[PDB]
Structure 1
Amino acid sequence: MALAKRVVHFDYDSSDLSTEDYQTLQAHAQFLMANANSKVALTGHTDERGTREYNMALGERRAKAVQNYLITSGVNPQQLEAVSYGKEAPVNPGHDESAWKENRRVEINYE
């Protein structure tokens, strides 16, 4: 079940991971260590609030926060990619809170 989750979320202007996101990440860490040839692309995103520049950096910190946890957990840095899309690729349009909660995220994409 933990492995079924391919996205973790963040609070406003934060790159801190929640206790729930950590459970998810531990599952992927174990899978990646057992599958040394599996590779993952981590994409960081933000909600539409703020400049494009500000959010590109925030998205990058989010992706790297996830990357660093996996690495600390034992995942080979070679199996990981960390990139930011800033506020350019929201999953939910509309300009409201709930929607922004969905957009503050890092997606885990297996190659």
Structure 2
Amino acid sequence: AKRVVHFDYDSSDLSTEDYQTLQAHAQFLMANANSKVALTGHTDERGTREYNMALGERRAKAVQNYLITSGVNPQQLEAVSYGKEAPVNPGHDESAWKENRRVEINYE
């Protein structure tokens, strides 16, 4: 499945769609003990760097929580936050911001 899940404004809540994507990664991870993923949290530009750094961390941790709760070994997961510092779209509208509020699933 895809390796990115998105979030709403000032929120670290996951949608039903996101759960489907995450369940696929959980299965792969539980089936491949040598695989490990880095979960990186991100935010759009609104708000201070410190506020976004923490929000990004809550997002990465929410994804982490879903995976662990589903049965994934914590050793195969690492969560980190980049806050607003690594946007995929530097635009200044919802279209751009929606792309930035995310958690990326990176293998290895």
The alignment's TM-score, normalised by the length of structure 2, stands at 0.99
C-alpha distance after superposition, 1:48-99 (max 9, x if no partner): 0000000000000000000010000111000000000000000011111110
Instruction: Give distance in 1, aligned partners of 2:15 and 2:96.
Output: 18
Equivalent residues in 2 for 1:1-111, closer than 5 Å: 4-111=1-108
Instruction: Give distance in 1, aligned partners of 2:71 and 2:30.
Output: 7
Q: Which sections of structure 2, spanning at least 5 residues, go unmatched?
A: none
Instruction: Give distance in 1, aligned partners of 2:4 and 2:82.
Output: 15
**Alignment: residue pair count:** 108
4+ long deviations beyond 2 Å: none
User: Once the two structures are aligned, what percentage of the paired residues are identical?
Assistant: 100
Q: Which sections of structure 1, spanning at least 5 residues, go unmatched?
A: none
The alignment's TM-score, normalised by the length of structure 1, stands at 0.96
What root-mean-square deviation, in Å, do the aligned CA atoms of Structure 1 and Structure 2 show? 0.5
